[PDB]
């Protein structure tokens, strides 16, 4: 499983995996700790810049996160890890197989709740010790005492008490002596979330049927009762800027705000996060600022701000609605295609099943930006025919880019599923282009290619017709008709003289682009599926249907190498920049690196999830892959 | 931000300091009784002397004004400055000013009020600090000459910029523009808060209610095409209706009757909101004139119901409440008058409620059906319920008579209901 | 009136001066060590200085009525009755969606002089001066051609 050429580097474009993020304050500034699968990333609240990432991937997925000043605690399976600046400092291993579920830190005690309704307490060996390390005791809540534990919370000014919140009711445990001081009355509806209020002795409890309860622990009595019919609360948070507001999140993806003093609704922010992916998984007010941070399972983190009231008087009543301030995001579903935008490793294009194309920056996370799909106005003056409701373009099956004429006109071609034309994009503008290329044979787009000079775009139809358009004007110029089945690959050499095509018929044709003549025709044994053309070396590799990669020398039109060993389809493959290796992925959950000079497999890997795509950097430093699971991109460093 | 922008914010805060002579001239020049040149020449003592007399005349008209003699119009108030006071003190002064603007809201036509407010404009610079409360109180006098003067000496807040044109302009603001000012939602919340203060203090008067009603009705009309805005309007304006209905004063309730009806036609609503509206209307219904307006409102609301159960019987609590405020004799009188509005759906619901809850009124059913022609679907529902009554309730002369009525008119429909039921 | 009482708080005895932040809690400079009950009571005051006590917690508690209307507004977010349940369509707004055109499957070469929907089956009949009778099977997504019938020299008007 361990490659001798490649090693994992990071995941790009993943901002949050749905686990509630944790907020920690260093002096004035605030930072946000977010979960990304098996690692966590720390973001600065002011600019949402990436600051730190955990050095190593945890053995099991992170479940809960709590941050306290420099130190960050991440809980995976039965182990609770302490991290400083993304460097593990110490590991708290619990003595039971039960997985930790919730995590609370107040003062020198650390509380970890396992799924077996057992609460472990750790303490600091010394009063000035930075983090708790020693094992103090173990408290367990039985089913008679209360139901499953929903969350562990600590209220201010409670000496060595932990407010355990259960589905049935709320309990108060004195960790120092491990005795149950108080059990709250039973609550009819299952509890889902808890939140300590800025007021004293009052903790906000979110139920499964749209109730929020300001339960007073000291008095053991309800104070207030909100109703949100037909909803499930997922998060709660109070505003500490001096105005008595409450933000209530819902699983449906809607965030509501109430003015407790006035008993009224300020506003509702609708569908801030997709309902499908868990909606508002976490929504927290920053301590003493008008800004509220929200996250969700759709791989997005957002921030909203409450502007000052416009009314010189009675500012309390006239409340501006919240305003989008800033955000960072990524794909909601695994990327389908990737490609390197630049000769350097700066920018990456990614297209996903979520019908969105993104530009990801390897050098910095902030630079990552989405390609807007707003269409340019038609030159003819005719009205563009489309549904009034705006819907994103279908996913991108194939893509091609060039940088010879960046900034002058469109330089990207993309094909869509079940769509009879290919759309253009402009990298410099980061916006869809003004040309659409039609196959002209009632066939769907299966291949897209561009000349090196950036002037010609080739579109391969499923009915065997290859069309050539001009990128700067989008006017059809020529059309080649050789294949009788779908063409699955097109490429043009660096000199723009010799052109090569391949189709499901298993035939490879050699065309002379300048004179428009068929130089020669080659038939292979099996249908061809994909093609990569290496312009420097004039070798191109075909992923045949018999689980073979065939290298052919365009100048001479002969098979030079044939690679065997794959146990299943070849989903994707790429050439090394120098023209010496081919890295191919297959459905047998492997990535094999093939040495073209010797024609044998020199390295092999077994990935847990099949790799849909593999792409070398033109420099040769990095190798990126996308997989059937995971919203991000795995980046690898070429140890060679 | 640029240096100029920040300095502008400093100037706006420091508007009423009177740092130098030129500033003192502009501030002292603003007036509601006098021109600029004479205004600069006057002193606080002369201005206060007129106000002290003017307040006395207002006191005779209304005793409540006499209280401010102890606070705002006292001889010590001459030496009182706002710029020199602390933050806590200015709030008490603002509260005193806001209370006074409420009392003077209804007496702007009288001459003395214009003198009395001059003391506050000159001494306390309400035209700069309490700008919002002054405009809100005098919004309904928009065509009056007094309102023109207020605009000339006042700097408009961000919410009132619709009037920016009409400052120092010969024409007074038109009726159409006032709809624009109310159209923005933010103003409605602001006006709602001011209106709420009036209800709490029972400071309302007919003219304010008339003008407040006319703007709110028009705002709905201007938003009839845009459904999504109308949805945002319901939380604000219906909330006002609940407050107006809480008021004991009848004219306040009648305004709630106007404003409720227009939404019901403007936007279809859930029955629960409609049913909730009835209980609020009927809780405080004591004045006769409000009582007449209420009954028309109740009938109009049900006509807007266009869903299953549109003619379902009222809930038991609602039925008992309705009969308490409207005996059976009253509704018969309402059914009598030839110019009645269409009320068939309510009578169908009110009809079925009797059969479920009040047996002894079953005779009244005969009178009610004769007076008003009900729709065929409504009649079918009445027949269906009465059929169940006969099976359960003991057979009565009135009960058979009600059938006998249905025998006389549309006999065939009677068989169809009987065929489907028994 | 506290529901519960914790005895460990009465015995616990904490020093103040060890940490800088707690130093504010002293009442007199001589004082250096306090039992728990006073430590909690002092912590309560400092907490208030951080987050002032708002109005809603203290003065107000929930624990035919006039306020019925204002209540029902609070619970409901959608103030417009669902049009799915009602069986009359709304007056001014039409909820209309386009589908695939019926004639894409087999185009007409002349104007569509008449249209007709079969009483029970899902069929549509078209005619024109093309002198043809085209019957289409309207599904809304494909709309293929069931049959066609050419009537020589009989221009189709209806």
């Amino acid at each position: 499983k361990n490659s001798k050429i490649f090693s994992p580097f990071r995941i790009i474009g993943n901002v949050s995996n749905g686990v509630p993020f944790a907020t920690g304050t260093l002096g004035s500034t605030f930072y946000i700790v977010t979960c990304v699968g098996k690692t966590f990333q720390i973001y600065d609240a002011n600019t949402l810049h990436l600051l730190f990432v955990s050095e190593k991937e945890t053995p099991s997925s992170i479940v809960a996160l709590s941050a306290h000043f420099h130190y960050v605690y991440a809980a995976y399976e039965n182990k609770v890890g302490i991290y400083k600046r993304g460097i593990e400092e110490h590991l708290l291993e619990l003595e039971t197989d039960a997985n930790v579920e919730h995590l609370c830190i107040f003062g020198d005690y650390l509380c970890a709740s396992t799924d077996d309704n057992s609460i472990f307490i750790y303490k600091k060996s010394d009063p000035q010790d930075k983090y708790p390390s020693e094992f103090y005791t173990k408290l367990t809540v039985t089913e008679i005492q209360g139901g499953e534990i929903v969350s562990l919370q600590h209220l201010a000014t409670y000496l060595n008490k932990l407010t355990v919140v259960t589905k049935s009711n709320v309990l108060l445990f004195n960790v120092r002596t491990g005795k149950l001081v108080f059990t709250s009355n039973e609550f009819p509806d299952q509890i889902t979330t808890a939140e300590p209020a800025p007021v004293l002795d009052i903790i906000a409890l979110g139920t499964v049927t749209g109730e929020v309860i300001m339960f007073n622990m000291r008095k053991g009595k309800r104070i207030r009762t909100i109703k949100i019919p037909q909803s499930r609360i997922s998060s709660l948070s109070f505003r500490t800027d001096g105005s008595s507001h409450l933000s209530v999140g819902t699983s449906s993806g809607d965030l509501i705000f109430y003015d407790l003093d006035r008993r009224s609704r300020i506003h509702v922010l609708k569908n801030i996060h997709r309902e499908s992916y868990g909606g508002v998984t976490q929504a927290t007010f920053l301590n003493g600022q008008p800004i509220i941070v929200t996250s969700g399972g759709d791989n997005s983190l957002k921030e909203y701000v409450f502007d000052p009231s416009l009314s010189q008087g009675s500012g309390d009543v006239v409340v501006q609605p919240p305003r989008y301030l800033r955000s960072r995001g990524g794909h909601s579903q695994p990327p389908s295609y990737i490609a390197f935008a630049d000769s350097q490793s700066h920018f990456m294009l990614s297209a996903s099943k979520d019908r969105s194309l993104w530009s990801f920056s390897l050098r910095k996370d902030a630079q990552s930006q989405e390609m807007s799909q707003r269409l340019h106005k038609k030159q003819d003056g005719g009205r563009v025919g489309g549904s009034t409701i705006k819907s994103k373009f279908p996913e991108i099956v194939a893509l091609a880019i060039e940088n010879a004429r960046i900034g002058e006109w469109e330089n990207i071609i993309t094909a869509h599923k079940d769509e009879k034309f290919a759309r253009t994009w402009d990298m410099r503008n980061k916006r869809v282009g003004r040309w659409t290329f039609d196959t002209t044979d009632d066939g769907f787009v299966k291949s897209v290619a561009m000349s090196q000079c950036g002037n010609f775009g080739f579109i391969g139809s499923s009915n065997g017709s290859i069309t050539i358009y001009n990128m700067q004007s989008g006017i059809l110029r020529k059309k080649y008709k050789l294949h009788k089945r779908a063409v699955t690959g097109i490429s043009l050499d660096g000199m723009n003289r010799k052109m090569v095509s391949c189709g499901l018929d298993g035939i490879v044709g050699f065309y002379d682009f300048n004179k428009s003549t068929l130089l020669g025709k080659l038939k292979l044994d099996a249908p061809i599926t994909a093609m990569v053309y290496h312009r420097s070396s004039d070798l191109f590799a075909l992923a045949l249907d018999d689980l073979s990669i065939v290298v052919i020398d365009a100048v001479t039109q002969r098979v030079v190498r044939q690679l065997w060993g794959h146990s299943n389809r070849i989903t994707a493959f790429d050439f090394s920049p120098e023209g010496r290796w081919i890295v191919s992925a297959s459905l047998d959950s492997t990535i094999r690196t093939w040495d073209l000079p010797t024609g044998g497999c020199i390295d092999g890997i077994i990935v847990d999830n099949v790799a849909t795509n593999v792409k070398f950097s033109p420099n040769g430093d990095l190798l990126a892959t996308t997989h059937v699971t995971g919203n991000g991109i795995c980046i690898w460093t070429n140890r060679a | 931000s640029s240096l100029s922008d920040q300095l502008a914010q400093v100037a706006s805060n420091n508007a009423t300091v009177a740092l130098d002579r030129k500033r003192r001239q502009k501030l002292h020049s603003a007036s509601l009784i006098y021109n600029s040149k004479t205004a600069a020449t006057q002193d606080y003592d002369f201005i206060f002397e007129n106000a002290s007399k003017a307040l006395e005349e207002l006191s005779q008209i209304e005793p409540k004004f006499a209280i401010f003699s102890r606070t705002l119009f006292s001889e010590s108030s001459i030496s009182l400055d706002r710029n020199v006071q602390t933050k806590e003190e200015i709030k008490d002064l603002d509260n005193a000013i806001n209370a006074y603007l409420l009392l003077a809201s209804s007496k702007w036509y009288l001459a003395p009020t214009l003198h009395a407010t001059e003391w506050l404009v000159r001494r306390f610079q309400i035209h700069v600090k309490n700008t919002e409360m002054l405009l809100l109180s005098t919004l309904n006098y928009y065509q009056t000459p007094v309102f023109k003067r207020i605009l000339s000496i006042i700097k408009l807040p961000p919410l009132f910029n619709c009037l920016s044109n009409f400052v120092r302009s010969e024409k007074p603001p038109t009726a159409l523009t006032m709809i624009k000012l109310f159209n923005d939602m933010d103003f409605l919340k602001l006006y709602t808060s001011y209106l709420d203060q009036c209800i709490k203090h029972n400071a309302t008067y007919t003219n304010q209610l008339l003008f407040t009603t006319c703007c709110f009705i028009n705002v709905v009309a201007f938003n009839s095409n845009n459904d999504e805005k109308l949805n945002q309007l319901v939380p604000i304006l219906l909330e006002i209706s609940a407050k107006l209905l809480a008021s004991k004063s009848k004219d306040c309730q009648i305004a709630a009757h106007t404003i409720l009806v227009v939404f019901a036609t403007a936007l279809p609503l859930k029955k629960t909101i409609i049913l909730a509206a009835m209980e609020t209307i009927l809780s405080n219904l004591d004045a006769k004139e409000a009582k007449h307006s209420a009954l028309l409102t109740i009938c109009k609301l049900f006509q807007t119901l266009k869903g299953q159960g549109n003619v379902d019987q009222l809930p038991s609590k609602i039925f008992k409440l309705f009969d308490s405020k409207f005996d059976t004799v009253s509704i018969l009188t309402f059914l009598d008058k030839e110019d009645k509005p269409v009320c068939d759906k309510f009578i169908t619901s009110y009809t079925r409620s009797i059969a479920r809850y009040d047996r002894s009124k079953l005779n009244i059913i005969l009178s009610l059906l004769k007076k008003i022609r009900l729709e065929r679907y409504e009649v079918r529902l009445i027949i269906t319920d009465l059929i169940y009554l006969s099976e359960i309730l003991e057979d009565k002369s009135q009960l058979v008579e009600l059938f006998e009525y249905f025998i006389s008119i549309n006999e065939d429909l009677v068989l169809k209901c009987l065929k489907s039921l028994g | 009136e506290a529901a519960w009482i914790d005895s460990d708080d009465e015995k616990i005895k904490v020093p103040i001066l060890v940490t800088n932040k707690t130093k504010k809690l002293r009442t007199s400079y001589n004082e250096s060590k306090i039992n728990g009950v006073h430590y909690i009571n002092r912590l309560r005051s400092q907490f208030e200085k951080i987050y002032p006590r708002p109005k809603w917690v203290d003065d107000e508690s929930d624990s035919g009525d006039i306020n019925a209307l204002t209540k029902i507004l609070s619970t409901t977010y959608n103030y417009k009755d669902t049009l799915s349940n009602s069986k009359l369509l709304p007056p001014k707004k039409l909820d209309i969606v386009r589908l695939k055109d019926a004639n894409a499957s087999h185009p007409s070469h002349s104007a569509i002089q008449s249209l007709s929907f079969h009483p029970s089956k899902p069929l549509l009949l078209t005619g024109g001066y093309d002198k043809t009778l085209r019957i289409y099977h309207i599904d809304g997504k494909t709309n293929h051609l069931v049959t066609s019938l050419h009537l020589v020299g009989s221009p189709i008007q209806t």
Binding site: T25, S28, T29, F30, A45, N46, F106, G107, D108, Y109, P127, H154, A156, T157, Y158, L159, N160, R176, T240, D241, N287, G288, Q289, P290, I291, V305, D307, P308, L310, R323, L325 | S1, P158, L159, N161, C162, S164, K180, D184, D186, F187 | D8, K11, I12, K13, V14, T19, K21, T22, G36, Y39, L43, Q46, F47, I50, Y51
Partner: peptide, 27 residues
Amino acid sequence: PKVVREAKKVEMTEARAYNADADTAKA
């Protein structure tokens, strides 16, 4: 003119927060 609705720049401000470290006590 209609009401201008400008998005004024919002920058962070210092705010005091209660620290739980004073809470834990040893006998």
